[PDB]
Paper text:
Moreover, we determined the crystal structure of Gnd1 in complex with two citrate molecules by molecular replacement and refined it to 2.37 Å resolution. Similar to the 6PGDHs reported in other species, Gnd1 forms dimer. The dimer is formed by the C-terminal tail of two subunits threading through each other forming a mobile lid on the substrate binding pocket. To our surprise, two citrate molecules were bound to the active site of each Gnd1 monomer. The negative charges between two citrate molecules lead to electrostatic repulsion, so they occupy a larger space than 6PG. Previous study has shown that citrate serves as an inhibitor of 6PGDH. Our current research provides for the first time the conformation of 6PGDH bound with an inhibitor. From the structure of Gnd1 we found two highly conserved residues, Arg446 and His452, to be vitally important for citrate binding. These two residues were also shown to be critical for 6PG binding from structural studies of sheep liver 6PGDH. We further studied the role of the Gnd1 C-terminal tail and found that it is dispensable for dimerization, but crucial for the enzymatic activity.
Residue numbers in the entry:
A (entry chain A), B (entry chain A): 1 to 476
């Protein structure tokens, strides 16, 4: 029948995607596990647009052009498998299932291979932008069956956010790759929110700035190198007054939530053996924050330095150093993010495209920023770039940051303001640039209590201690 | 027939356990997947001791007193399930399978429940001490079927290391709990090795100490508050000369290995939502070290501060500050370790005993130290202690450490020596003691781009913004 695609799952997110598609001249068939929301949606915001409803699953399936394109925006987990299982029999080879939910990539790897067995095409797609991003242009990160891409390309790229004419949507890669890349985006997200919160914390508890003053600093920083959506909303949150003129944010319970996609990145980093330390710290910091009552109790007993009113003499220098600390740390976190992507490409055998991934994150998504355009640029120039930090633009940024980065950390250190993300970024940076790390002692220790053996430095190879061989020493 | 227990798996580890049991007056039946190693072992080190061999699996099973006690010391994974599956039919209800290998606890949870279904008793046991620890007194951490404990108690406690008359072996708890606790011990281990390596690195690259000088510092520190096995072997490694008089350790390739048990703790911390940041950093640092060629390349291009010959004027003060940094950081890592244990007890419904776990880690194991005795003591006094840092002894240690801890970190920061573990410990400490963290902004941010909602501080509850309710604000 008539409908370019259908979408099941009519939460605000999916409704806005359908609306977005309709506005771009697609006929969309809207459906849900239930009914109330279909009729209601057709009655209100879908009215007078190219949006048709459905009553049955077979009705839905019947209203869709060939090959049938079935997008799901449902809760992750078994409900995704529920729909898939009741849709497969109503389908024929070459039809396309699109999971747009925040599904864990091994599930998408599985659904991909299972559907493939039946000749059904699978697209596991990341979607980012929130409610309003879905309405006007989300970031879309499709992966799965490559042969499904020519069929969803025009729908996806038309509705996606644009960055300098270019759509924020390219084919990510095979199997669970789209959801994988969406996962990492969410890990990076956690990192950027933690880094921003540390800047706020240092200005508040160390500098003694009012929220309006910290808001103005974010206003100022957004006008420069840190230009980004998260810095904008932070600027906006910090000046937001409660009904009583007092800053609303200072009344919020300081216990961070996490639905899960953030820990997944840290876990994956661990599985893959990549040092994604900042995202790790960002996840652990939310875990720390959850422990509200334990911290109230801790605050009454554990000592720390006094923060005098005059700890910051030069407020301009303080703020300028902090900007470089935030900015350099962010560069570390993203450099770590792309190391992860680099290792996952290699381990999973996925041909992940670094410029395209950065492009897809430039707009639509929560982490959108000018900074990301600069990442796209670096990888356009060298798509084989082994680390972001080997790019001149980022190497220069990090060189310029040196003094402000270290000064802000020593300052937070001296005055007892927690900087988990700033600290781990500098430690990683200083470790990463070390030709020789103290892991030589680590190896010696291991060979000592466990005879686990060790390799010799090629420049130290000798009679005993030969190159490319596992050496054990009797240390006793 | 005759044999208190049998042990399958005749690697050096298991051989030494059998030997240890024999010396304590047990008749042990030795067996292997194969034969050569059984005959060979009976021919040499088991000769003239109460150790008998076996030829068949049924032969092995027949030589064992009732209820039959079958210990496995084989490679983790499927080989453990292999043995179990071929032993179960040759067994009868109430017989006891003991897995002493380094098995991942969910596997032990599974084997426990499966064997339980057949009325077979299961013990998943941690074993720590290495080759020589197995020969004279390892740490043993049994968990599984409580009803198996009265049957293995005397064998286990007799052969285990002693700390002040007390055996380093108590019943850990149900299902996979023994292996769980062994896992965490190994996470803690990673942390202590990384912390030690950072002290070494700072003295070497920042202080410009020779290895003999750093060895003497560890000699000195081992005579005090840091008294421990790992500090001893480090002291010993650092003075160890290669065949050419040059320090051997400086020739070792600085790429750390990890068999896996270390990442498991960080992953579990993530699954459980506990801020086990130091173990995380220790695992990530090994991951960083593996990247040898990328770091050589990084070292040639990325800038950092110069370390002048006179960066350390006062070597005595430098060393004294560092000792407090190492010591305070270690206290953080262990405090994090027991938070993990605390959450796992609660989430899994396991009645984990904190004094007993600390006791079991006091001796035999790689992390053995006087420090651990002090942990046992703290939990004997208050077994309900919510955090180690609420204990006076540790609170005082951390109070005394303040100045040396922060000074060493600011120093490594200023001069560009990586201190991932020192840094994360201080950040965690400063976060943990904060009544209010900037997770209030995090929550505001989330409620803004995703309407995820937030709670109000009870002391800020009002007309709008009521207590114990999920608030959303229209920030725009």
């Amino acid at each position: 029948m008539s409908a370019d695609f259908g979408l099941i799952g009519l939460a605000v997110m999916g409704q806005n995607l359908i609306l977005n598609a309709a506005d771009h001249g697609f006929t969309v068939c809207a459906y849900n596990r239930t009914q109330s929301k279909v009729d209601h949606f057709l009655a209100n915001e879908a009215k007078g647009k190219s949006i048709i409803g459905a009553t049955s699953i077979e009705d839905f399936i019947s209203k869709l052009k060939r090959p049938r394109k079935v997008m799901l925006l449902v809760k992750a987990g078994a409900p995704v498998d529920a729909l898939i299982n009741q849709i497969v029999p109503l389908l024929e080879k070459g039809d396309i299932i699109i999971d747009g939910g925040n599904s864990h990539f091994p599930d998408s790897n599985r659904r991909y291979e299972e559907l493939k067995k039946k000749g059904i095409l699978f697209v596991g797609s990341g979607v980012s932008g929130g409610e309003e991003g879905a309405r006007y242009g989300p970031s879309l990160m499709p992966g799965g069956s490559e042969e499904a891409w020519p069929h969803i390309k025009n729908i996806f790229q038309s509705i996606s956010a644009k960055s300098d004419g270019e759509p924020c949507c390219e084919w990510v890669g095979p199997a669970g790759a789209g959801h994988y890349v969406k996962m990492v985006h969410n890990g990076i997200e956690y990192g950027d929110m933690q880094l921003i919160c540390e800047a706020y914390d240092i200005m508040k508890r160390l500098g003694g700035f009012t929220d309006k003053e910290i808001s103005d600093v974010f206003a100022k920083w957004n006008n420069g190198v840190l230009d980004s959506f998260l810095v904008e909303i932070t600027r906006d949150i910090l000046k937001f007054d409660d009904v009583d003129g007092k800053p609303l944010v200072e009344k919020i319970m300081d216990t961070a939530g996490q639905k899960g996609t953030g820990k997944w990145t840290a876990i994956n980093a661990l599985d893959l053996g990549m040092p994604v330390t900042l995202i790790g710290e960002a996840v652990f910091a939310r875990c720390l924050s959850a422990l509200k009552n334990e911290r109230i109790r801790a605050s009454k007993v554990l000592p720390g330095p006094e923060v005098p009113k005059d700890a910051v003499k030069d407020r301009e220098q303080f703020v300028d150093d902090l900007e470089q600390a935030l900015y350099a740390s962010k560069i570390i976190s993203y450099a770590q993010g792309f190391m992860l992507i680099r290792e996952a490409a290699a381990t999973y055998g996925w041909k992940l495209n670094n410029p395209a991934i950065a492009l897809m994150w430039r707009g639509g998504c929560i982490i959108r920023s000018v900074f990301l355009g600069q990442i796209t640029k670096a990888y356009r120039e060298e798509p084989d770039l082994e680390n972001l930090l080997f790019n001149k633009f980022f190497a220069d940024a990090v060189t310029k940051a040196q003094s402000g980065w270290r000064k802000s950390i020593a300052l937070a250190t001296t005055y007892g303001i927690p900087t988990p993300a700033f600290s781990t970024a500098l430690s990683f940076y200083d470790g990463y640039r070390s030709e020789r790390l103290p892991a030589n002692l680590l190896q010696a220790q291991r060979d000592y209590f466990g005879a686990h053996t060790f390799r010799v430095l090629p420049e130290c190879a000798s009679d005993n201690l030969p190159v490319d061989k596992d050496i054990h020493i009797n240390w006793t």
